[PDB]
Amino acid sequence: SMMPKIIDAKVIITCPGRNFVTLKIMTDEGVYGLGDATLNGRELAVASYLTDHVIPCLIGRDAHRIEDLWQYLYKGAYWRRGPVTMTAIAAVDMALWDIKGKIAGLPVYQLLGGASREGVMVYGHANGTTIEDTVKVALDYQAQGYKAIRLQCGVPGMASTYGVSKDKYFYEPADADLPTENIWNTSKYLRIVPELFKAARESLGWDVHLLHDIHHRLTPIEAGRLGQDLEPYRPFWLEDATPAENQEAFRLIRQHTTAPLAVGEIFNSIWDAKDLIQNQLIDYIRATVVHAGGITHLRRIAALADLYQIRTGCHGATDLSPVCMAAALHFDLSVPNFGIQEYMRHMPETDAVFPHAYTFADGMMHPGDQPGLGVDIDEDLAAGYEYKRAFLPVNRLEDGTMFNW
Amino acid sequence: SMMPKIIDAKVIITCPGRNFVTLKIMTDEGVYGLGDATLNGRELAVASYLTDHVIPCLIGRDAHRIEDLWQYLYKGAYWRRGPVTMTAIAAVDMALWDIKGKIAGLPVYQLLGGASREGVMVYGHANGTTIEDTVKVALDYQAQGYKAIRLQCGVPGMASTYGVSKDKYFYEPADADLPTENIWNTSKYLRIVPELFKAARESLGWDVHLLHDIHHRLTPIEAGRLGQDLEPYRPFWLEDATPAENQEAFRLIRQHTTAPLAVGEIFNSIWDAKDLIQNQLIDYIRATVVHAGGITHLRRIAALADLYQIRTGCHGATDLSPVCMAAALHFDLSVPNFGIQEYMRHMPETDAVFPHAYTFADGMMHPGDQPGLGVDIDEDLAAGYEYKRAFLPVNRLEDGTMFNW
Amino acid sequence: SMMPKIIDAKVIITCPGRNFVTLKIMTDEGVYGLGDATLNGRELAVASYLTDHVIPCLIGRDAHRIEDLWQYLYKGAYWRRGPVTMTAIAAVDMALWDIKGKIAGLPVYQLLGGASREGVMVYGHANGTTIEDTVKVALDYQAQGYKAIRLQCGVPGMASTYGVSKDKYFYEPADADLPTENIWNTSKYLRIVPELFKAARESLGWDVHLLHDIHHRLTPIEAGRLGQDLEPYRPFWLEDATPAENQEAFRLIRQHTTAPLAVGEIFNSIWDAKDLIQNQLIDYIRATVVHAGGITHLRRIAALADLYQIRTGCHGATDLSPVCMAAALHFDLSVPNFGIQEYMRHMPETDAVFPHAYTFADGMMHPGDQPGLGVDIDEDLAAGYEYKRAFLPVNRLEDGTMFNW
Amino acid sequence: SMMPKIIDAKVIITCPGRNFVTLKIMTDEGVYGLGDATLNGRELAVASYLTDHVIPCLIGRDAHRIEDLWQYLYKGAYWRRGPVTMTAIAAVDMALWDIKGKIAGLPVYQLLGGASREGVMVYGHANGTTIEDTVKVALDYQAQGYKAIRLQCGVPGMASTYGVSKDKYFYEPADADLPTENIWNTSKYLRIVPELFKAARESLGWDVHLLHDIHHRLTPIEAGRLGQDLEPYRPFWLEDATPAENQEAFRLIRQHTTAPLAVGEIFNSIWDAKDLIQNQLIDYIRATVVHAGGITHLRRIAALADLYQIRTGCHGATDLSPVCMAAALHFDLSVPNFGIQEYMRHMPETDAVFPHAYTFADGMMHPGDQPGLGVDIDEDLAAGYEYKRAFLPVNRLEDGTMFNW
Ligand SMILES: [Cl-]
Ligand SMILES: [Cl-]
Ligand SMILES: [Mg+2]
Ligand SMILES: [Mg+2]
Ligand SMILES: [Mg+2]
Ligand SMILES: [Mg+2]
């Protein structure tokens, strides 16, 4: 019945504890949709991609035509793929699915096949300077009812490492108006992680799922070894073992370890993962609605993965807004090959700016049953938190060589 | 708002010109859905699969949970895949999507991404005893506005061959209460088809799309040769070149010809086509909503094909009911990598039994905009046409060897 | 001399402790043959496939022409392969071999190359709630003279798991008029099986063959790990490690463990196993006469397997009738690459309905030396046990996701 | 009922127009079986293999146990495979199948699945010094009702070539008490064959099947070219294009031509053909009952070939005795993937020594319906034709280099 045309769209930028960029699409029927467009450390490039280029092309279009607009933006940009490009496309896609649900009077998961499960298992983030500190935090997460917990500890002798900070229920690495410089030592790291997992199993037991993020810092043969060393402790996954622009990079890892492997939070399209999937080089795909081209495209990534029993493990750090989390949870509740959802808690100010229907209890989340995504933005409140430039950190080897953070 | 539970389901069997089996699923809200379950020549095996086994398990279920029921039936059968199994699953799936659209107040294509195109290109079926007869019929189809036409002619010296009969706008091969026996000669066939295409281009010109169905009758190296011989005439596709249970069977064909290849009307799951697709051995995938596990599963087949620029070419013979055609047209209007839709006209009695919203004009079809699939069944009218046993034909070589029909 | 034509055939359905479907083919010479057509949980779909479609085509045919009828039904169905299709074909094939033996005055094994061995080694089924319970039952089987024993134990903390029940010499999972729902936890399972095998070797010693059925519940990399963990205990096989519709699914398993692998009880044709065999991904093929197209086709599966030193390990649960067991034992005694035969004991009522010549003693079976298969059906007795609907169970993960049973 | 033990066996050697070696196996029930053991040009090596080694091991064995004796001889020889070894094994195997049929009171084809066809298509042999001579002979074969004809012509400027002689309905190359020396020129040959096929199609037309035997004389890239040059004339096959000990040798041929390829008359086991078959490098497999390990083993070769739509094309030159031809025709009538049977006529003296039931009419043969193979040997008549040493020819290049005949 309702046949809404897009009449206006705008980018809202706000910093309630950290930067978020949001797309709002309005139709002539008064129904609107929201999409996350946040790209941590490069936020204003996406805002411009949208405001200056994409939005003008949205005006007048049939909001029902989700696939058509996806293809129009993907093919029509001419220069294909990429983090800025695909995040802009995701934002439009999310917003259109939001609108579709509102028109249908159904939550988005009902449009994607309905619920495949009763709730969405998440993991939280235990970090500490020492192994003892890390295990103590993990015990707290376990008591709170988390079924899965990521472990990150300090590397002895090294001032910093990925995932360790003063924050407990999250990790906010974009912490400075210029990139914070870190120093990395692979040898020390390879020896500490197995000791961490040993101590963790001793205190937590064997039912809880234990995860670890390598954060791009190993070569393939080094990752193969870390895998071998962690097998005794049965990790749920080892994530981002080695840079993956070359999709053959995981071959040596898979040849040498049975530790389950996860990758892809920085992937922006199926083309970044096609060979990793088809060659059975990974067990979990980490791509997200916001960074890999929205619900439309993420469903295709998941479908390819399903053929090889690879499961979804969407990235869920703080730099994905509650709009992204809402979309992710609708995707998670409905996708058949769901694995796990990452859950870092947002600041209270963030929750206030983005009121939402999704809930967390007893280690499980649910997207809620409001029409569409079940999320909104309080524009008046958002206007009170001005953008503040903040970069992700960089990492160098001890001789000064640029390395992977 | 509406949360319908399945309260009853039943199989309706009717023969308005030919046999059709239809599943009707009723919910406690009064909304119902329809699914085609027709499996030509083996119809009552699916009716029993549904009535005796599947239907009892449907009662009480949440009709919104399409994916859950698909997986429940697919995995839960224990014995996986197969023509009877997957047709029963398709029928349930179609019916649930029908219900979903009705609940949403939207035509099904609006749930599958919206319209990717303004209409759906179809092909019709020109057949004749001689090449001259065949080309004359093709000229009529072309004048009627068909943009694409399948050509089948008699093989000189042979009493019968696939696709040639007294019927003009369709072909009804299940014509006897025991399988009609045919005699096949490959040598004569390989020499006639290139002469047919030569004559066709001479009269029809080069804009019209010309198709040919080999109907499983060649070895791979023979199909490679027929391809080479047809390249000059630029066929839109050569279909079912060789039996494909062995998915390596298309390798020699693809090595030796650039004629576009189509296969898969008899496929019932993605597992029948995964290697043909990933190895780039075909250009069009012919699997249908009714025989390959419904909309849910056919979308996954299409998504895999899309990665390799392979397009959909759904089978559309008379033994797929208007319920299947409605679903196919919703799929066709929304799938991004649509290629073509086969369209054989149904008998008037069939149209009367299955009133529908889909339309045909100027070589193009459209699913219409009624909620759900836009199809119904007139049960009182259906009851007046009793089931009549009818088998597909068989084919033997001249020495009597069982062969492929 | 005798040249029998088929004059009639019929499907007999009976439930002497569980459902069985049997095909009886009568010839004009008075000689008849029997074939099992039982497809657990979907029985009436095969009965209809036979009664309504296949049987009409059998009438008048030369019963000597076994290959011709196999090809006629396989190719002639048009829609190829599948559990209902291939079980119907198997039933006809078994019945025709039965007839052939009767005409020749020889047991069927004498037509298949003669005896390759003096008897057929079988395995029995030890199950228990605890490891201690399971090992105690295994000790009893070992004392009874079984040379091979399958071990299944409960998963601590989980109400149910595959293969564990109150029944000792068999396992009857189709136990309800709707599918029983189960809840699955992979983590707990992966830790219990190695403890079971450790305890088993401690009590049983190292000569006995010990088997385990994973029953489709692991991903490939998980199965690789379970394999690594079980190698110390030298399992005879680990069965159905991961769903195998994708035949590449066993690649990661084979890469990482030397535990012998078995698969295929649910396969219905050689096309389900060709790549698993040719790529040397398994050690035993489990396909059966009744579900994979009869003696004619199972011999071809075994011949392909033989080239790679892969051996037969026919499935032998209670849902394969004594008619199937008779055929299996004739196949087993004659096939060169025989590995083992599964043997679950039938209820006394079942044995009464299907009198047979095959015997069991000291862990070994033999098909007997009666003409044909050496099995009959007491139709009067069968008529007293009416069909009773019963489904195989389903399995879900703890979040409710449909999973593999 | 009858359970015959082998009591004696003997080798009969006779030369009714050419050398034949025959194995006769006698049982204590008085039933006997015959097997061909003729290995052209090396006949007495097989006679000794049998008389001195195999026969002593046969005495006392259960004649019903065909598979057991096959494996016993194949594995038990220790030194596996080979022309002398496998011909001895074939002779035993043929003789045991002969016995099995006699015991069953059935012709052998009835034990191998029954008849798959009404008769067996054969090809005859047209040869001439000039192309004109060759085509004239072919016209005669065509008039006589042959559906398929091999063409061999002289190479202009060359005194001899394979397949050309004064004999019309056969070719007897083992013609001297020392190997006849021939001189070969590849260049001249590559230019003459396409002219032969051109002339043949001009006179014979396009329905008849036309075959050509390259007889091992080309390199792969040369065979690829000859294939390309013959495609216009649609040869039924091009046989033995290049020596095939290296099974990769056919790769370049298959890459470059769609002419159908045949190989394998000199193969003695499936191991000589496994890769040619699995890599889809040939269309017809030419191995015979007598040289590739009998009926038992040839059925396995055919079954592997069937998976790839490769058909049988048994070699049938005069040096295979009527005992072999009888076995071949029982195999041919029953094998599902039959392609064609070679038929060279034997001398009248040969037919007198080996009375048989098989017949030829109108280009088709049939094994007949006598129990067993339907062949016998007249020992008194055989005794009147003494062995006469005769070698196959050799071939050298013009510089004297040893080459392939
Ligand atoms: Cl970019
Ligand atoms: Cl089926
Ligand atoms: Mg990460
Ligand atoms: Mg077709
Ligand atoms: Mg099992
Ligand atoms: Mg030759």
Residue D12: Cβ-neighbour burial (10 angstroms; 0-12, 13-18, 19+): middle
D120 and D150 both lie in a single domain: yes
Same domain for B61 and B164, yes or no, is: no
Q: Which of A1, A71, A334 sits opposite B105 (nearest CB)?
A: A1
Q: Tell which residue, A353, A251, A335, A358, has the closest CA to residue A287.
A: A335
**Residue B168 touches chain D, beta carbons under 8 Å:** no
Give which of B149, B309, B162, B163 is closest to B236, Cα–Cα.
B149
Taking the CA of residue D82 as centre, how many other CA atoms within 13 Å lie in the half-sphere pointing to its CB? 14
Between CA C341 and CA C358 the distance in angstroms is: 13
Q: How far is CA B273 from CA B35, B253, C144, C248, D321, in A?
A: 24, 16, 48, 14, 47
Chain C residue closest in CA terms to D93: C113
DSSP secondary structure letters along A256-274: H--S-EEE-TT--SGGGTH
| Nearest ligand atom owner, CA of B45 | 2
Nearest to C109 by CA among C363, C374, C319, C286: C374
Strands C181-184 and C394-397: parallel
Closest CA to D397 of D405, D386, D385: D405
CATH number at residue C191: 3.20.20.120
Q: Which helix (H) or strand (E) holds A137?
A: helix A131-143
Nearest CA in chain B to C401: B68
Specify the DSSP class assigned to residue B206.
S
| Structure tokens, D28 | 């204590």
Cβ atoms of residues D179 and D394 within 8 Å? yes
Same domain, yes or no: A140 and A196: yes
Identify whether B109 is a catalytic site residue. no
Under a CB-based contact definition with an 8 Å cutoff, are residues A150 and A169 in contact?
A: no
- A251 shares contact with chain C (CB less than 8 Å): no
Q: Residue A264 and residue A310: Cα distance in Å, rounded? A: 13
Distance A86 CA to ligand 1 centre (A): 7
- Tokens found for residue B30: 């009064």
* Strand partners for C210: C149
CA distance C16 to B295: 41
Q: What six digits make up the tokens of D34?
A: 């015959």
Return the structure tokens found at C355.
């009198």
Flag if A66 and B307 touch (Cβ within 8 Å).
no
* 8-state DSSP, C345: P
Interface membership of B136 toward A (CB under 8 Å): no
Q: Which DSSP string corresponds to D81-98? A: --HHHHHHHHHHHHHHHH
Strands D148-153, B359-361: pairing is unpaired
* Same-domain status, C115 and C199: yes
Q: Which two tokens stand for residue A326?
A: 């809402």
The answer to whether C177 touches C389, Cβ cutoff 8 Å, is yes
Q: Is D120 on the interface with B (CB under 8 A)?
A: yes
D353 Cβ neighbours under 8 A, 6+ residues apart: D14, D16, D20, D377, D378, D381, D382, D385
Cβ B57–C392 below 8 Å, yes or no? no
- Alpha-carbon distance of C162 to C153, in angstroms, equals 9
Q: Which of C289, C288, C227 is nearest to C260 (CA)?
A: C227
- Ligand closest to B405 (CA) is 4
H or E element that contains B350: helix B348-353
Mutation site, B43, B388, B402, interface C, largest C CB count within 10 A:
B402
When computed from its CA atoms, the radius of gyration of chain B, rounded to whole angstroms, is: 21
Looking at the fold, whether A340 and A404 belong to one and the same domain comes out as no
* Residue B66: alpha-carbon gap to chain centroid: 22
What resolution in angstrom units was achieved for this structure?
A: 1.8
Chain centre distance of CA B8: 28
Shortest CB distance from B245 goes to which of C47, C80, C266?
C80
Q: How many CA atoms lie within 13 A of A320 on its CB side?
A: 26
* 3-class SS of residue A161: coil
Mind telling me the catalytic residues of A? 162, 215
In terms of Cβ atoms closer than 10 Å to its own Cβ (0-12, 13-18, 19+), residue D378 is middle
Residue B126 to residue B135: CA distance in whole angstroms: 8
Question: Which residue blocks in D144-249 are alpha helix, DSSP H?
Answer: 186-204, 220-230
Question: Is C291 one of the catalytic residues?
Answer: no
* D57 CB burial (10 A radius; 0-12, 13-18, 19+): middle
* Binding site members of B for substrate: 40, 125, 265, 286, 315, 319, 342
Kindly compute the dihedral angle of the four CA atoms of residues B76, B77, B79, B83, in this order, to the nearest 10 degrees.
-130
Q: Residue A267, class by beta-carbon neighbours within 10 Å (0-12 exposed, 13-18 middle, 19+ buried)?
A: buried
Q: Are D149 and D193 within one domain? A: yes
- State the DSSP H helix or E strand holding residue A70, giving kind and residue range, or none if neither: helix A66-76
Enter the tokens of residue C397: 């993960």
Strands B20-27 and B32-36, how do they pair? antiparallel
A313: Cβ contacts below 8 Å, ≥ 6 apart: A237, A262, A284, A285, A286, A339, A340, A341, A342
| Same domain? B139 vs B249 | yes
The residue whose two tokens read 């919910």 is B27
What strands lie across the sheet with A32-36, from one edge to the other? A6-14, A20-27, A32-36
State whether D308 and B243 contact (CB < 8 Å).
no
> How many C-alpha atoms does B41 have within 13 Å on its Cβ side?
24
CA atoms within 13 A on the CB side of C154: 12
Largest CA distance in chain B: 66
Catalytic residue among B212, B215, B297, B356: B215
Q: How far apart are CA B38 and CA B47, in angstroms?
A: 8
Using the mean position of ligand 4's atoms as its centre, give its distance from the Cα of residue C166 in Å: 52
- A78: tokens are 């001419």
Q: Which residues are CB-contacts of D102 (< 8 A; sequence separation ≥ 6)?
A: D31, D33, D371, D372
Q: Decide: D216 and D162 in contact? Cβ < 8 Å.
A: no
**The domain containing residue D119 runs over which residues?**
108-369
Distance CA D356, CA D366 (A): 11
Selection from C397, C399, C82, C400 nearest residue C219 by Cα: C397
Six-digit token string for B151:
């050509």
> Where is the binding site, in residues of B?
40, 125, 213, 239, 265, 286, 315, 319, 342
> How many Cβ atoms from other residues are within 10 Å of residue A380's Cβ?
8
Does residue C10 sit at the B interface (CB-CB below 8 Å)?
Answer: no
Against chain D, the chains showing at least 3 CB pairs within 8 Å are B, C
Q: Which two tokens stand for residue B349?
A: 């009695």
Q: Which residues surround ligand 6, an ion (CB under 5 A)?
A: D 213
> How far is ligand 5, taken at its centre, from the CA of residue C213, in Å?
5
Residue A216 Cα to ligand 3 middle (Å)? 8
Please check whether residues A227 and A194 belong to one and the same domain. Answer: yes
Query: Based on the structure, what is the number of domains in chain B?
Result: 2
B145: region left, alpha or beta (phi > 0 left; psi from -120 to 50 alpha): left
Give C205: exposed, middle or buried? Use CB within 10 Å, 0-12, 13-18, 19+: exposed
Q: At A329, phi and psi to the nearest 5?
A: -70, -35
Residue A307 contacts C, CB cutoff 8 Å? yes
Q: Which residue of A has its CA nearest to C249?
A: A308
Sequence-ordered list of residues with C-beta below 8 angstroms from that of C182, at least 6 positions apart, any chain: C159, C160, C161, C393, C394, C395, C396, C405
Query: Rounded CA gap, A321 and A310, in Å?
Result: 26
- What is the per-residue burial (b if ≥16 Cβ within 10 Å, else e) of C244-261? bbbbbbbbbbbbbbebbb
C49 alpha carbon – ligand 4 mean position (Å): 23
Structure-block tokens of residue B125: 């079926």
Given CB atoms, is C80 within the 8 Å cutoff of chain D?
Answer: no
Distance from CA of B216 to the nearest CA of C (A): 10
The H helix count followed by the E strand count for chain A is 13, 16
Instruction: Find the closest chain A residue to C185 by CA distance.
Output: A207
**Single-letter amino acid, residue B174:** A
Chain B nearest-CA distance from C143, in A, is 34
Residue A72 burial class via C-beta count within 10 angstroms: exposed 0-12, middle 13-18, buried 19 and up:
middle
Going by C-alpha positions, the residue among A58, A74, A67, A44 that lies closest to residue A9 is A58
How many angstroms separate the CA atoms of A305 and A264, rounded?
12
Question: Quick one: tokens of B277?
Answer: 């697709």
First to last CA, chain D: 51
**What is the rounded CA–CA span in Å between residue A36 and residue A23?**
6
Whole-number Å distance between alpha carbons of A138 and A126? 5
Q: Which of A189, A195, A196 is nearest to A219 (CA)?
A: A189
Strand-pair partners of D212: D238
* Cβ(B354)–Cβ(B322) below 8 Å: yes
User: Cα(D161)–Cα(D169) distance, rounded to whole angstroms?
Assistant: 17
Q: Which residue of A has its CA nearest to B114?
A: A65
B383, two tokens: 């009851």
Which-ligand-closest: CA of C212? 5
- DSSP three-state, residue C260: coil
In angstroms, what is the span from residue D213 Cα to ligand 6's centroid?
A: 5
**How much distance in Å is there from the Cα of B49 to the middle of ligand 2?**
9
CATH code where residue C64 lies = 3.30.390.10
Q: Report how far residue B285's alpha carbon sits from residue B277's, in angstroms, rounded to the nearest whole number.
A: 8
Which burial class, exposed, middle or buried, applies to A21 when counting CB atoms under 10 A from its CB (0-12, 13-18, 19+)?
buried
**D80 SS3 class:** coil
Q: Which two tokens stand for residue B130?
A: 């001689």
Same domain, A39 and A148: no
Contact list, C40 vs chain B (CB under 8 Å): 78-79
Same domain, C119 and C188: yes
Residue B110 with chain A: CB contacts under 8 Å: 64, 100
- Pairing type for strands A120-128 and A364-366 reads antiparallel
Q: Which residues of C284-320 are buried (b: 16+ CB within 10 A; e: fewer)?
A: bbbbbbbbbbbbbbbbbbbbbbbbbebbbbbbbbbbb
- Residues D64 and D126 both lie in one domain: no
Q: Please provide residue C71's backbone torsions phi and psi, each rounded to the nearest 5 degrees.
A: -65, -40
The C-alpha atoms of residue B290 and residue B283 are separated, in whole angstroms, by 21
In one letter, which amino acid is B15? C
For B25, list phi and psi in degrees, rounded to 5. -110, 120
Amino acid at A331: F
B248 touches chain D (CB under 8 A): yes
Q: Do C114 and D307 touch (CB under 8 A)?
A: no
Q: Which residues of C touch D116 (CB under 8 A)?
A: 65, 67-68, 71
Rounded Cα–Cα distance for residues C83 and C87 (Å): 6
* CA D23 from centroid of its chain's CA atoms: 18
Ligand sitting nearest the alpha carbon of D216 = 6
| Cα distance between residue D377 and residue D360, in whole Å | 20
Chains B, D: CB contacts within 8 A come to 50
- A351-354: long-range contacts (C-beta < 8 A, 24 or more apart)? A351/A322, A352/A16, A352/A378, A352/A381, A353/A14, A353/A16, A353/A20, A353/A377, A353/A378, A353/A381, A353/A382, A353/A385, A354/A20, A354/A321, A354/A322, A354/A323, A354/A378
- Which pair of structure tokens corresponds to residue A11? 């980018």
Where in A332-401 does DSSP place strands (E)?
341-342, 359-361, 364-366, 394-397
Given B74, B162, B171, B358, the catalytic residue = B162
Nearest CA in chain A to C400: A117
C-beta atoms of C64 and D115 within 8 A: yes
Tell me the CA distances in angstroms from D267 to C337, D289, D292, D301, D315, one per residue in order: 23, 11, 6, 11, 11
Residue ranges for the known binding site of C for Mg(2+) are 213, 239, 265
Report the 10 Å Cβ neighbour count for C393: 18
Output the CA A340–ligand 3 centroid distance in Å.
14
> Do the chains contact at A308 and C248, CB–CB below 8 Å?
yes
Q: Helices D294-306 & D322-334, crossing angle to 10 degrees? A: 40
Do D362 and D380 belong together in one domain?
no
Residues of chain C contacting residue D278, judged by C-beta atoms under 8 Å apart: 278
Which one from C215, C330, C356, C366 is the annotated catalytic residue?
A: C215
The answer to whether C102 contacts chain D (CB < 8 Å) is no
Identify which of D246, D240, D316, D306 has the alpha carbon closest to the alpha carbon of residue D277: D306
Approach to solving = X-ray
